[PDB]
Structure 1
Amino acid sequence: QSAVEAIKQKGKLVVATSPDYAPFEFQSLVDGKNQVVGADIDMAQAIADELGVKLEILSMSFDNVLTSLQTGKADLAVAGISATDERKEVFDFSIPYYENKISFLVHKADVEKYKDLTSLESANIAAQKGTVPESMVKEQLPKAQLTSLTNMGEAVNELQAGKIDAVHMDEPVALSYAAKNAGLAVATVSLKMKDGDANAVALRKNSDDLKEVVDKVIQKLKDEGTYQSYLEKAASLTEV
């Protein structure tokens, strides 16, 4: 019943994530080898360090991250996860570690074009399966052709190929794609967003002892501006 003691005993903290989402988590050539990096990984490492155990990152597609936590394949899920009311019915969440807006990534040549929701309504929109940006499009733009894709990298590949006109995603991720790729930009139009709902670490219910440790680490990061600093450092890394 003791999450903290169980983690200490096995000597590792297992964190489920989906590394398709720079600057939160993504793949980068460190040395040498492909490695999962990003602000969420630095935070997960801080939590593991506080507990005195090794960090083990378990990579999968986003739409299976919460399920893997729920069924015991990981101790925590950290994947830029919005702490929604719906999700709070099933999981407990840490205090928020970062709060951001939600944006559309488009072609630079189309920034003047997609100025309102009516214009997006007639566009081919992509979003990630099992996500808040996906739900928002379904709710607020029901008349749009929405393509739901498992992997965010594939959504962006479809945007680059011209099969998709706009991809809905967390703003820091859109900014990163725009900053690292010539033909891309963040649209000036955005959907109405669910008040509250910041990123938080997900845990199984009745994990109060582990939640306290996670909250302590997160509060210290926010107090020192460290999570912001982690995001800025991640932005200087190249993705695979």
Structure 2
Amino acid sequence: ADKKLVVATDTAFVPFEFKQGDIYVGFDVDLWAAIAKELKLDYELKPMDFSGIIPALQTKNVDLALAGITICDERKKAIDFSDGYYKSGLLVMVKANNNDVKSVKDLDGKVVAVKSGTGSVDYAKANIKTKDLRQFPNIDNAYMELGTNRADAVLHDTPNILYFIKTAGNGQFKAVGDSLEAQQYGIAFPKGSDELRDKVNGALKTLRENGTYNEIYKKWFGTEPK
């Protein structure tokens, strides 16, 4: 019973972290619990907005974080990452009856809604000449900026977008283009948590080969490609 690790998590990032009644469920929730079981660790989930997860690690108010955090070189100057646990990317979503946009290129001189503090904003800042880039603390407010056509498209992570269309879009939104900015998701740790980082990486490999990872993956992403 050494102590309870504090695990920072996203308030809403379906299907990796979301609120289901009085508990949190998702891919990251199932994956860490398995990791914490292997390494015999006690922990608590602390959901918060994504823009404060990395600062929470920098200020050492949280012991680690699992929230679709993309492994980035600019972020490694500030925090430590584990080994990738999911290959992801960015994808453009527009309304279902919209046909003038067929890829991210058609989004030049248009209004794009994104989530503040995420990478989708830097990609949009560096590769799209938006007439206006509208940022929202949670991605659900971006969705509405699209549904009511105040914004022309949302650019966010591929699994989040392909799950939102799958579950709560109700055939009102569609995915146009191909996956972009190939990236990998990693468990983030504050600088100086090297012993725990190496242990988590070891438990990661154990679950990748004994099939527990494929068990959790098949649960949320069905017959998703390895």
TM-score relative to the length of structure 2: 0.89
- Decide whether the 8 Å contact of 1:19 with 1:36 is kept in 2: no
Alignment of 1:1-240 (within 5 A): 8-10=1-3, 12-29=4-21, 34-110=22-98, 112-180=99-167, 181-182=169-170, 183-188=172-177, 191=180, 193=181, 197-224=183-210, 226-227=212-213, 229-234=215-220
Q: Give CA-to-partner distance per residue, 1:56-103, whole Å, 9 cap, x none.
A: 111110000111122122110110000100001111110111111210
The Cα of 1:163 is off from its aligned counterpart by: 1.7
82-91 vs 136-145, which moves further: 136-145
- Decide whether the 8 Å contact of 1:92 with 1:204 is kept in 2: yes
CA distance in 1, matches of 2:23, 2:150: 30
Q: Give CA-to-partner distance per residue, 1:19-44, whole Å, 9 cap, x none.
A: 31111111113xxxx21110011112
170-179 vs 151-160, which moves further: 151-160
CA distance in 2, matches of 1:199, 1:46: 17
Whose strand fraction is larger, Structure 1's or Structure 2's? 2
CA distance in 2, matches of 1:56, 1:199: 21
For these two proteins, the number of residue pairs brought into alignment is: 220
Alignment gaps of 5+ in structure 1: 1-7
**Superposed CA RMSD:** 2.0
Question: Which amino acid in the other structure matches residue 186 of structure 1?
Answer: A
Alignment gaps of 5+ in structure 2: none
The Cα of 1:232 is off from its aligned counterpart by: 4.2
Decide whether aligned partners of structure 1 residues 150 and 228 sit closer, same or farther in structure 2, where only a CA change above 3 A counts: farther
Which residue of the partner structure matches residue 4 of structure 1? none
Q: Give CA-to-partner distance per residue, 1:115-153, whole Å, 9 cap, x none.
A: 134421132101111111111000001334110111111
154-163 vs 89-98, which moves further: 154-163
